[PDB]
Ligand binder design. Structure first.
Ligand SMILES: CCc1c(-c2csc(CCNC)n2)[nH]c(C)c1C(C)=O
Ligand SMILES: [Mg+2]
Length: 104
């Protein structure tokens, strides 16, 4: 489990400092985005994964992968592919699948 959680730390750090990460650093504010609360049932963002990972609330790397994927699934549910946020989500998702697969 040590190697699981430590690569989780690596990939999370790299997502946090990635150029295209700007939409996903903090929770979406439903007051600012019309219709978000109604459409996205389980919001997720990199700072929430950071909190949980630091507290140790991820038992395996698979749950960490679940939260990251949830970030990008929400992104694609709410945002147009050609929107700025959608484009950044695609760069970040491709990034994450890529970094995940070259380890596991
Ligand atoms: C379009 C709003 C949005 C942002 C957004 C736009 S601007 C910004 C600054 C955050 N501070 C680093 N976040 N992100 C996500 C995941 C959004 C949606 C609706 O899915
Ligand atoms: Mg999926």
């Amino acid at each position: 489990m040590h190697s699981d959680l430590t690569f989780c730390e690596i990939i999370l750090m790299e997502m946090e400092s990635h150029d295209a990460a700007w939409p996903f650093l903090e929770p979406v504010n439903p007051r600012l985005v019309s219709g978000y609360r109604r459409i996205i049932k389980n919001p997720m963002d990199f700072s929430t994964m950071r909190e949980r990972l630091l507290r140790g609330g991820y038992t395996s790397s698979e749950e960490f992968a679940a939260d990251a994927l949830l970030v990008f699934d929400n992104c694609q549910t709410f945002n147009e592919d050609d929107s700025e946020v959608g484009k950044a989500g695609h760069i970040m998702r491709r990034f994450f699948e890529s970094r995940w697969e070259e380890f596991y």
